[PDB]
């Protein structure tokens, strides 16, 4: 237990990736965050001022606080028998706007717009077709298999 500093065992974790170093994006500076959206707290180095502790690196969570240049993010931390909603304070560059809901952001956007189209809408344009069923399949090349040595 000789060393347990705030940045311990983190050579490869905060190290920038191969052939992508230097200053942060202009997207990451032109992001727009509110109190409530989700963010991937992907601590990048090359800013080295506002990086969170190692633990909060693959972690995503609500933004409970947006200061001028520091996003405050709550993150669930399974301590021992309970999770703490930790309240980390990082700068914006250590933050992505988390996709994690486009799975149903973009689903119910067109899913309702066609459920409405299917319930009332204007008309019901036919959609994606069935996937798994039978069929009298016609082959196009026969083959066999014994060995290759």
């Amino acid at each position: 237990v000789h060393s347990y500093g705030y940045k311990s065992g983190t050579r490869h974790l905060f190290a920038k990736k191969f052939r992508k170093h230097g200053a942060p994006s202009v997207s990451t500076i032109l992001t727009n965050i509110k109190v409530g959206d989700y963010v991937d707290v992907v601590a990048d180095s090359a800013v080295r001022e506002g990086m969170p502790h190692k633990y909060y690196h693959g972690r995503t969570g609500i933004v409970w606080n947006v200061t001028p240049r520091g996003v405050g993010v709550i993150i669930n931390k399974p301590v021992r028998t309970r999770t703490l909603r930790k309240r980390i304070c990082v700068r914006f560059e250590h933050v992505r706007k988390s996709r994690c809901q486009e799975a149903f952001k973009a689903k119910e956007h067109q899913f309702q717009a066609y459920l409405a189209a299917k319930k009332a809408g204007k008309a019901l344009p036919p959609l994606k077709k069935s996937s798994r069923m039978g069929g009298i399949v016609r082959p196009k090349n026969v083959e066999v298999l014994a060995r290759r040595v």
Binding site: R132, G134, G135, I136, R138, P139
Partner: protein, 222 residues
């Protein structure tokens, strides 16, 4: 005056019975002809294929029938939580189970413990009739009459016992209802024995998937 309301509503004890064994009768044939028809229709599509130069891919098994074949001894906690969600809480608790993508991977992970396959029609009702129990008010109540079924499911479609079978034999529209409304099938150890229990069914043992050969395994257990 009390012996009249009863005597009048004891007719409801009789009229609602005969008016229940008729709905039970009229659908149980419609289900049998779904069986007799859609199997005949399966043959021809496999007649026109093998004759005129095609292959009729046998569509898919919609439903699996998962029996836990090793006990509650030392079990990895992920192996153990899966079998708690399949309701395989003790040895030989055959349960009917869809084979979705999410589901069949819960079988992939606990195969050393389970022994599943695809249930024949003859083995789906053999389960339901000889060993079928319902969850009446949190109790394991045997399926003794069709009246026990409709009171428990209530879902406008599930009236008789051959009707629970058709919901189980096909992937059904009421399958999370007919199965979850039942207790896992506490079964007997198969007569004649098991070849092993530690090795897969393909390596001389017996577990994992035995496509359609679990009937020869459930017959000895029902």
């Amino acid at each position: 005056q009390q012996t009249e309301n009863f005597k009048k509503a004891v007719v409801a004890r009789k009229a609602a019975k005969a008016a229940l064994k008729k709905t039970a009768y009229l659908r149980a044939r419609k289900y049998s002809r779904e069986y007799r028809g859609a199997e005949k229709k399966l043959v021809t599509l496999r007649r026109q294929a093998a004759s005129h130069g095609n292959y009729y891919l046998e569509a898919k098994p919609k439903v699996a029938v998962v029996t836990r074949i090793r006990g509650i001894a030392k079990v990895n906690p992920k192996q153990r939580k899966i079998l708690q969600l399949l309701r395989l809480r003790q040895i030989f608790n055959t349960v009917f189970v869809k084979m979705n993508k999410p589901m069949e991977n819960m079988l992939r992970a606990v195969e050393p413990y389970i022994a599943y396959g695809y249930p024949s029609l003859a083995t789906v009702r053999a389960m339901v009739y000889k060993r079928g129990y319902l969850k009446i008010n949190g109790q394991r109540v045997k399926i003794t009459d069709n009246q026990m079924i409709k009171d428990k499911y209530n879902n406008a479609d599930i009236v008789c016992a051959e009707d629970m079978v058709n919901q189980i034999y096909t992937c059904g529209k009421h399958f999370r209802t007919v199965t979850h409304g039942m207790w896992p099938f506490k079964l007997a150890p198969p007569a004649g024995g098991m070849r092993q229990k530690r090795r897969h069914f393909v390596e001389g043992g017996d577990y994992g998937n035995r496509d359609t050969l679990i009937n020869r395994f459930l017959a000895r257990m029902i």
